[PDB]
């Protein structure tokens, strides 16, 4: 699955100091970034423009530039009238998922101080189930701006699918790319008296889905404690899998790695004898 996620982080220290920074993700890949101090989108991939013409691309950029200024002025005016105290953090999560099997679904979620407050549902703004009373005052005002509503709908229901389809075409190779992990063992801090912490590291794999387990022959060890899948600077992943055991019982244990990049050849690392 390759959903497009457009993300916006807007911080307001006070009514005179603000900062808006955005980014776009196609699946697990970051395709775009847009800093507060730039008038233009920074394309992070050679295929970031998709199938859009230079003209269509300048139109989308114009829309964001207008939106960014307008969002800022609007939040400041809502804060003033609704007696909302600074600092304010607003977050936006918008995009779509192109499904050749069915239609396409889109979303536009807004958060205030790390909590959901409203979303764009069909052709209008809807507040979150448990949202403060001032949110319904802001929704009324937002829904009065019919032209913005028609634009958000045009972007989510027409432009986003056209953008995603093109990125998926121009990006075919980079999205289907395979990077092989390299595995290594280590001994972690003792988790008891005569106990051993058996650590298995797996780094440099792409794509993100992986399977790492401590084994004893073909018997999967249920004591395997996986860590979080952590990122690397070169767009690959890291994963640490542990096993708390008796010191004697470590001999015969193996770390086994399954990854799509492996050519039918799982990584098997034996605990040293």
């Amino acid at each position: 699955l390759f959903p497009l996620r457009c993300l916006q982080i807007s911080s307001f220290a006070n009514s005179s100091w603000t900062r808006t920074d955005g980014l776009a993700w196609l699946g697990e890949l970051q395709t775009h970034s847009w800093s507060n101090d730039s008038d233009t989108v920074r394309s992070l991939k050679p295929w970031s423009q998709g199938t859009f013409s230079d003209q269509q691309w300048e139109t989308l950029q114009h829309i964001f530039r207008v939106y960014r200024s307008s969002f800022t002025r609007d939040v400041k005016e809502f804060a003033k009238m609704l007696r909302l105290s600074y600092p304010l953090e607003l977050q936006v999560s918008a995009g779509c998922e192109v499904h050749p099997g069915n239609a396409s679904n889109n979303f536009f979620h807004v958060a205030f101080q790390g909590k959901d407050i409203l979303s764009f549902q069909g052709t209008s703004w809807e507040p979150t189930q448990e949202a403060p009373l001032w949110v319904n005052l802001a929704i009324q005002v937002l829904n009065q701006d019919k032209w913005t509503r028609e634009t958000v709908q045009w972007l989510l229901n027409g432009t986003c699918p056209q953008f995603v389809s093109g990125l998926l075409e121009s990006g075919k190779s980079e999205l289907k790319k395979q990077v092989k992990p390299k595995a290594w063992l280590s001994r972690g801090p003792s988790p008891g008296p005569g106990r051993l912490l058996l650590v298995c590291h797996v780094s440099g794999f792409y794509p993100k889905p992986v399977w790492v387990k401590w084994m004893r022959g073909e018997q999967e060890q249920q004591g395997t404690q996986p860590g979080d899948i952590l990122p690397n600077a070169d767009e690959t992943w890291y994963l640490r899998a542990t096993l708390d055991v008796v010191a004697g019982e470590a001999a015969g244990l193996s770390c086994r790695v399954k990854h799509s990049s492996l050519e039918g050849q799982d990584i098997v690392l034996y605990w040293p004898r």
Epitope: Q56, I63, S69, W147, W154, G158, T159, Q162
Partner: T-cell receptor, first 114, second 110 residues
Framework: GAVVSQHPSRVISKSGTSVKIECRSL??????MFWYRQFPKQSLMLMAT?????????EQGVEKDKFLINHASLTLSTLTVTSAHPEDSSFYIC?????????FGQGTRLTVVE | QKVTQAQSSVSMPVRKAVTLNCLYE???????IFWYKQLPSKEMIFLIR?????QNAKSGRYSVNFKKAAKSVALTISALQLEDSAKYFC?????????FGQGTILTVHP
Amino acid sequence: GAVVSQHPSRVISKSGTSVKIECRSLDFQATTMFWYRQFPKQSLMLMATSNEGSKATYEQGVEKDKFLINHASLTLSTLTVTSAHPEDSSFYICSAPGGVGAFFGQGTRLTVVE
Amino acid sequence: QKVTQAQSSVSMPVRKAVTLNCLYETSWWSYYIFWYKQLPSKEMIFLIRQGSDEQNAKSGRYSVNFKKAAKSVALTISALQLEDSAKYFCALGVTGKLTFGQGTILTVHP
């Protein structure tokens, strides 16, 4: 009623003088204004885009120094027809995005006499 | 982005109906089509809008026969009155940036 006002509605100018046309948004803030030109018995051709903060965008085939655009504020865009000649005698109409698409001004009937 | 109005002039008697044709070209998957009339004062009067993902638009005496596949957006003016004599412009636009066709002069006869 109209929410965008152009001033003046009519202007007679001598060749070689620069003509200033104003486009005002009435009781709304506009961050963009589109400027169109219509020659007699012709269609409306988009000339340029007036932007707040950034410079004007000119359309393909438009002479950039002939027309000086300036987004003075969030309610005012000016078009200056620098050193006008009878060939520049036309009808200039601005619009502001909004409503169901864009709000048009009433236009400026510009006649340049030698 | 191009809008073509092939008819330069159309004449029709009062109380009848007329059809003004419009063909367009656009690289956008979703867009809006507009119809305008220009007064002898040169003032632009919005008539009707048609969304690419909408049902055939209808606003009083104005109707659109939107044919998405053929990329045609004709305007029918029903029960024609002398006040309908004007130059009618078809336009394609996204986010207020409208591009106009050549225009069609309609002359309603008594």
